[PDB]
Amino acid sequence: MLKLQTLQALICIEEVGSLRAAAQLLHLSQPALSAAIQQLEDELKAPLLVRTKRGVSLTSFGQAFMKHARLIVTESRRAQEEIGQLRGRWEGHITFAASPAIALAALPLALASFAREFPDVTVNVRDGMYPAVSPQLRDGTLDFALTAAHKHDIDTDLEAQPLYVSDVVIVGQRQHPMANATRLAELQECRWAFSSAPRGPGAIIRNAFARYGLPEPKLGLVCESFLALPGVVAHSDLLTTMPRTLYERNAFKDQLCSIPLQDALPNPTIYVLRRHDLPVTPAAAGLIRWIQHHAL
């Protein structure tokens, strides 16, 4: 029998004056409790209980021992309470960073379902992108990030689980002069709103231009806000690249077009990124499952 339940029982035996009565009160087996106390007495080499007409009393050794017993039972309760609070604070909070596409499609449906399965968790959500999220993942102020990355180029401190394979489209003002282009080379003369990517401003379009044999793309401006990007392109002649989800869910849809090229653009893999030494909360894993569920 678990020692703490034995000590707990002795505490009860002191108050109600019977082994039998104590076992029934704490829902323990009489023959098991009796054998536990006996075992303990043999280890102690003294009796804790002396019989009377009514029941039992603590012996002299029993009274000495009970002071220790009382402190051990109390310490156990306090320990479980301290850690219950600390763990309660831990499990009750999630802080993460999401890419624009996850935030526009996956997250909203994920968050609804999640909050039913995990009703007691505050979630804190922010915009984020790798490599910028790396330092706060590392220093712990950020639990995980849901962001694009390149497998062969990720921090070693970080674990990376693929979430889904994403799409990138070239976007322009609805009647862009190059709306009918089928090739990258046909856009050499356009100016670009360099959108953000793991390898730097406009890295996706620069690298596309490079592999297809073209010079550097002509810069129009650098637009790091994905919130601002769709309207900016709508009121200018600048082209940009963006996630398909952003193109499909933005405020300026009817003023924009995509320019679908027969030349291939990349498919940025979206990753769960977190520090690997770190333990993941049940809720954190839960939220990931739900976002995953809506990223199929």
Ligand X SMILES: O=C1O[C@H]([C@@H](O)CO)C(O)=C1O
Site string for ligand X, 263-282 (x = CB under 6 A): ---x-xx-------------
| Cβ proximity to ligand X, 132 vs 203, nearer residue | 203
| Cβ proximity to ligand X, 70 vs 150, nearer residue | 150
| Residue 235 neighbours by CB under 8 Å, 6+ apart | 173, 255
Site string for ligand X, 191-210 (x = CB under 6 A): ------x-x---xx--x---
Q: Which of residues 115-154 bind ligand X (CB under 6 A)?
A: 150
| Residue 191 neighbours by CB under 8 Å, 6+ apart | 218, 219, 220, 237, 238, 239
Known binder of ligand: residue 99?
Answer: yes
Please give the structure tokens belonging to residue 261.
């090229």
For residue 107, the minimal CB distance to its own copies (Å) is 6
Rounded CA gap, 96 and 145, in Å? 5
Residues 182, 149, 140, CA angle at the centre, nearest 5°?
Answer: 150
- Residue 156 interacting entry, from ligand X, its own copies, none, C-beta within 5 to 8 Å by type: its own copies
* Residue whose tokens read 């976002």: 291
| Cβ proximity to its own copies, 100 vs 286, nearer residue | 100
| Cβ proximity to ligand X, 128 vs 268, nearer residue | 268
| Cβ proximity to ligand X, 5 vs 207, nearer residue | 207
| Residue 11 neighbours by CB under 8 Å, 6+ apart | 66, 69, 70, 73
Rounded CA gap, 49 and 59, in Å? 5
For residue 72, the minimal CB distance to ligand X (Å) is 32
Rounded CA gap, 245 and 282, in Å? 29
Burial class (CB in 10 A: 0-12, 13-18, 19+), 96: buried
For residue 99, the minimal CB distance to ligand X (Å) is 12
**What is the sign, positive or negative, of the torsion defined by CA atoms of 69, 72, 78, 80?**
negative
Known binder of ligand: residue 234?
Answer: no
Q: Which of residues 34-53 bind ligand X (CB under 6 A)?
A: none
| Residue 220 neighbours by CB under 8 Å, 6+ apart | 191, 192, 193, 194, 236, 238
For residue 213, the minimal CB distance to ligand X (Å) is 15
- Residue 197 interacting entry, from ligand X, its own copies, none, C-beta within 5 to 8 Å by type: ligand X
For residue 108, the minimal CB distance to its own copies (Å) is 4
Residues that bind ligand X (CB under 6 A): 150, 197, 199, 203-204, 207, 266, 268-269
Residue ranges for the known binding site for toluene-4-sulfonate are: 99, 101
